[PDB]
Amino acid sequence: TTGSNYYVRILSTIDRELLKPNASVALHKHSNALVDVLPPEAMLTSDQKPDVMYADIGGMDIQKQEVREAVELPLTHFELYKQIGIDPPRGVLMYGPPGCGKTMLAKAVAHHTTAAFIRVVGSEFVQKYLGEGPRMVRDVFRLAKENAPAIIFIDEIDAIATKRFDAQTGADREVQRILLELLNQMDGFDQNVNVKVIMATNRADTLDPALLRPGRLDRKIEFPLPDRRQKRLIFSTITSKMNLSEEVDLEDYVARPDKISGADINSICQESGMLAVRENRYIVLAKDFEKAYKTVIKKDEQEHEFYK
Amino acid sequence: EVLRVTHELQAMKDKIKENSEKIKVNKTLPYLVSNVIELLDVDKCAVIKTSTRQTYFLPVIGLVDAEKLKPGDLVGVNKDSYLILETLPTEYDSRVKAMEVDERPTEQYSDIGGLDKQIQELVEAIVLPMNHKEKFENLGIQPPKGVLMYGPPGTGKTLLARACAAQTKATFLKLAGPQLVQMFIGDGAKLVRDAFALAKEKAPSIIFIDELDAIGT
C-alpha cells in the first residue's frame, strides 16, 4: 500500500487458495514477506438508512420498470435470464437533465434490495496521497463482490471520467488510472456472480466514449423532464402528501406545461405550504398555490413574438 | 534550610537544564516546523500536522502554552521526538515578501506637474487618514477606501504611485497585476490574502496594484 508493487516470497503455511488477484494480503515490516490473506477490509453497506418509498416517487413508471427490470430482478430471478438466453445488463447508466428521477429512484431502489446497496459518491476516488485511489475503488468493487448480491451506486461520474485528460502535470495522471483500471475491473466480472454497477450523472454529453461499449454498462436510461400524462401524477402525489381544502385545482396548473423538473414541483408545492405558514394556516386554499407557482412557477423565460 | 538556597538549584540547572536546555539548544539546529490543526482535552494535548505531509498526536509539552497555541498557526517541533518546542509567527512565501520597497523617495511632488487636483485628491484621499484621522473622526465619517487611477495610454499613474509612496512615511508594497495569476489553483489566491495579511501585520500600509487588466477580464 506504500506506493509500489514489488516482489516477495510467500511462506509455506498459508495455502495457495485465497490468493485472488485483488486479495488484500499482509506483508512483514522491514522485510516485506507475505504472511496471511485477510477478510475484505475497505465504503458502507448502507443498512436501512435511505428512506423514500417507490410509491411516492410520482409519475416515473417506464424508468421505474426498466430499473426494476435490469437491477433487482436479475439479482432475485438470476436464473430466468439463464432460461431464456438474454444476459442481465451489467451496468446501468442514468443520464438525467437537469435531474428529475435520479436520486429518489436510486433511493427507493435501496429498500427492497435484500442486497448490499453500497454507496460511494464518485469524488473521493481522488485523494491527496498519490497512487491511492485505484486501490480504493477496487476495494469498493470487491467489497461488493464478497457481499453479493450488491448494487454499486457511483454518482456524477464526470468527476472521475471525462473525454479530455492531460498528459503533463499530474492533476489527472491518476484519474486517468482511476477510470482505467475500474474500466479493467468491470471487465473482470463477466463470470456473473452478482454485482450490478448502476450510476448516475446530470449530464452525459462529456462522459467518455469508452465507458459503455456493451460490457461496462450495456444500458442507458433517459430521464424525461416530464410532460402532460406524467406531470399530473407528480402533482397528484406531492399534493397527496399535504393538507388541501379543495379550492385548489389540479389540471389548471398541469396546464401551462412549460419546462419543469419534479424538483420545482416540490418547490412550488413546498413553497405553497410555506407561503401558507404566513397566516399560520394548517391548509392551503387558493393563492399560495397560484401565488407560489407564479412567483417561482418558472420565474419566467424570455419568449421571442414575431417568430411564433 | 540555608543550604537549600542555590545548591539544589544548580544541580537541576546542570541536570534539568543540560538535558532540557540541550534540546532547547535543538530549538535551532535540527529544529522542525508544523501546523497544529486542533487542541483538545483529555482527562493539554494537540494534533499537529508536520509539513512532510503527515500529522501526529502529542501531549502538549513545555515552552508553549494552551493560550499561545492557535489552531492553524506555524509551530515548530523536534525531528525525532515530535514534541512542540516553541512557536513561530505565521508565514508564507517570499513572492509576497518581495514587495518591500524601501528606495521609494526620489520622485517628490515637484516632478509631477499639471495634475495638481489629482495630487490633492489622491494625497487627500490616502495620506491624510495616515496623519489626521482623529480630526477626521471628529467629523464622524468613514475613512475612504481604495482609489482607482485611470487614464488613456500613459499619463502620470505610476509616477503618482511612487511619488505618493515616496513621501508617505509608512510601509508600502508594489504589487503587480500578473504576479497574482499562476498555473496552480492555490497560489494566485493564497498570495493576495497573505498580501493583505502582510499589510494587516505591518499596517498601517497602502497597497498599489498596477494594471488590474490582469485580474480584470
Add this chain to the structure above:
Amino acid sequence: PPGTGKTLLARAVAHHTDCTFIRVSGSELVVRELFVMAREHAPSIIFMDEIDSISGGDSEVQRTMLELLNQLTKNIKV
C-alpha cells in the same frame, strides 16, 4: 447508415486473417507512436470513427497516417 456493417465487418475480416485490430477511434488516453506498435505486430489493421450524428474530427489523423502510409512494414491497412 449508422449500424448495419460498421465495427463488425472490419472486425470479422481482421480476425479470420488473425491480423490484429487496432482502433484509434478517440484520443482519450495515450498520432505517430501507434505506427511503431503496428509495425511491431506485422500485420496490422487500423480502424476509425464515424461521428456526425447517430469540423476536422478524424480526417486529420486519417491522412496523417496516409501520409506515412503512402511511402511506406507494409501489411498495415487503414
Add this chain to the structure above:
Amino acid sequence: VHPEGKFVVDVDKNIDINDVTPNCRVALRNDSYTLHKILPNKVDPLVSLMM
C-alpha cells in the same frame, strides 16, 4: 522502477543478458540493485488499448 522510474543496474551471471528485451518487466535489485530472473511479460502497450 515503479514509484520513481529510473536507474541503471547490473545483471547476475545466471541471467544471460542477451534475451532480456525492452518493455518486458522483471527485476530483483533487492538492495544493491542487480537482476536475478524474468517474470510474466505483463501485457505490452496495445494489449492495453484493445482490452
Add this chain to the structure above:
Amino acid sequence: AADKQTLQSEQPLQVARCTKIIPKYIINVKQFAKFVVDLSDQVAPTDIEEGMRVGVDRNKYQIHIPLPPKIDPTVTMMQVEEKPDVTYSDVGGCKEQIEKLREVVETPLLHPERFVNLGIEPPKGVLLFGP
C-alpha cells in the same frame, strides 16, 4: 582521473528555499518539511537573506553554500553567444536609420562619457517597423 580521495570531503548538498530570520532561519526543500536551521561556520549573516536559495546537507541538515537563482526554461535564450557574421558593412541600403539604432545600442561603449557629461540618460527601447 584520480578524484577518489576528494569525493568524501564534498558533502552532496540539497538546495532549499530560505525565508525569514529571527540566529535562526527557515529553509524549504520543496519536498521536505521547511524547517529551522542556522549557518555553519564561515558564511556571513549578511550573506544569506530571504528569498534566495542555499544548500543544505543531509546528515545533520544544515547550510554551507549560498546558491544562485534558477532560470530553467530561459537558459537557452540568454545572450545567444558567438553571434552571426553580418555587420554594419553588410546590411546596406538605409545609412541613417542604422545611425539612429546605433547610438542607442552602443552606449556602454565610448558614449557614457558624453551622457554623464551633458546630463543625458539614453533611450532604453528601440522599435523596428518594416514590411
Add this chain to the structure above:
Amino acid sequence: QLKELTKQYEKSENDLKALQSVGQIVGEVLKQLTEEKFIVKATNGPRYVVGCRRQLDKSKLKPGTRVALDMTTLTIMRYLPREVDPLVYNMSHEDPGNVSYSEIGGLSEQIRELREVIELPLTNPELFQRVGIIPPKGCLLYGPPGTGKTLLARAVASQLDCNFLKVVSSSIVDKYIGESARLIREMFNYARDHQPCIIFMDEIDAIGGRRFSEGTSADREIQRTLMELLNQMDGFDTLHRVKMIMATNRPDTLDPALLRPGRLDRKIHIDLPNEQARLDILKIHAGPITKHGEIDYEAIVKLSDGFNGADLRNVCTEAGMFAIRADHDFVVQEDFMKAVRKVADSKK
C-alpha cells in the same frame, strides 16, 4: 531566595517530564475489530494491522474513528474524537459585527423573508409537517452588486445562535489534488456535528458551475469539487438540520445542477433601492455624521436613481470628504448636492 525558585523554577521542572514524551501518529480504523488486532488507515499512510491497548473500550471503536498509534512499537493508544481543520478559522470566527437590521435599509421584505426561511424552521419546526412538508434548505442571494449581500449575512451573523459558518468560496480551493473535496466534506461533516448550523458561502462562482469541456486541470479539479459539494447538499439524507445560503453576483453563470430547487430552493432577488429604500440608505449612512436639520434628502433621492447602498454611503463619504478638505462644521446641502453629482459621474 527559595520560594521564588521553588514556584517559578520548580514549576518549570515540567519541561523534563514533558520532554520525556514521544508523540503518537494518528490514523483511522477501517474497523474490522479483528478482535485482538485491528486494521487502521494512517493519514498519508498504508493500511496495516495493529495490535491493541489491552483494556481499551473496543466495543465503541467504530469504523471510521480517529485513533492514535505508537511510533516505534506501533500499538494503538488512546482514541480521538473526529477532527476539525482550521474550520476553526471558519466557524469559530467570521464577520458578525454587532450589525443589526437597523443598518439594513429598505429591504425589510427580503430580510424578514430570509430570516423566516432560515431560522424559523429552527424556531417552530412542528408547524411544517403539520402543513405536511419539510422546510426548504437554501437561498441564493442573486442581485446587482453592492445592494447588501455579504453584509445581509453579517446581520444574520450577529443575530443567530448556531455556528454561522461564514466562508469565502475562493479560500476553499488549494493546489493539492483532491484537497478541496476533503475540505468540503470536512465542512459538511462539521455541520453534521454541531446542529442546527448555517453555512455561508458567498461569491460562489469559484465553485459556480456551467461546467466546461476544456481547461482540464484548473477547472475539472473544481468541477469534481462541485460534485462533492453538490452530492452533499443533496446527499442521501436532506441534511435535516443545517441550512446553507449563498450570495453572489452573476447568477447566469451558475450550474443548473446546483440551482434545481432542492440544492437552493428560494432564490432571493435582492434589488437596487427604488426611492423609499434610497432614502432609507441615505438616512442610515447619514445618521452618525453630524447634520443640519431640514437637510433636503428628498431632492437627493429624487436626483438620480440606479445607485446602491454602497454608492449612497459613497455619497455621505464624499460629502464628509468635502468638509474635511474644505474645513467646515458638518456639510451643507451643497455638499450632498456636490456629492451625488460626482457619484453620478462615476458610471461604468
Add this chain to the structure above:
Amino acid sequence: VIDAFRLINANMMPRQTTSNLGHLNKPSIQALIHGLNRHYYSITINYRKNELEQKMLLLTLQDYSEHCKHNESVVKEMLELAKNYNKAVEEEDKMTPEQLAIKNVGKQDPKRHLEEHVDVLMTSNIVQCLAAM
C-alpha cells in the same frame, strides 16, 4: 526471546565455551543490534522445571440435529465437489504443464477439499459414535 548481558561499556581489554557458544554467531544479525552487541554480550538462558509441574500442565450429541446435519451437509459437497474433481481430472489429463499453472492459486481448491471433507466425518461419524456402543 530472552537474553541477559554485560557491562562492556568499557574494557575492550576467557571461557573456551566449545568455540564461542554457538547461537550468538546466529542472532538476527542487524547492524544496530550488532552495534548494540558490542556492549551487550549475551551468554545463555538455562531452564529448570520439575516433574510435578510438567505433569500438571500436560459426550454424545447424537441425532439432536447433529449427526444428520453434518452428514446431510458434507455429502452434498462431496457430490458437487466430486463433480469439480471430475472436471479437474478430465481437464488436467491433457494440456497440463508447469505444475498446473502453480496449483490454481485461483479458484482454490479442488480435490484437497474432498480429502478434507473425508477426514472430517471419519473422525466424527465413527469415534464418539463408537463410544455410543
